[PDB]
């Protein structure tokens, strides 16, 4: 009697430096909101 | 290595924050909240 869910990245069940980028600045976030 | 604490929800890449986020003035908190 179990249910298994599925999200974007995979399936969830019941509990029994070189790659970093730049984040948006506060001004752009305010503009987006 | 570089320690990161956020990842882009759509871009799927680790992010680097801006100093203004750590120094958020109360105006931005009031507006975004």
């Amino acid at each position: 009697n179990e249910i298994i869910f599925g999200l974007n990245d995979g399936y969830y069940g019941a509990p029994f430096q070189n790659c970093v980028r730049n984040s948006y600045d506060v001004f752009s976030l305010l503009r987006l909101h | 290595t570089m320690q990161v604490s956020f990842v882009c929800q759509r871009c799927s890449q680790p992010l680097k924050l801006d100093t203004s986020f750590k120094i958020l003035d109360r105006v931005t908190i009031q507006e975004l909240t």
Binding site: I3, G6, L7 | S5
Partner: peptide, 20 residues
Amino acid sequence: LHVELPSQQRRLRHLRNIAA
């Protein structure tokens, strides 16, 4: 493929599947 660090929003909008 789920990076387990926090701040990863996990809401109903990202959910598209169900099974028993």
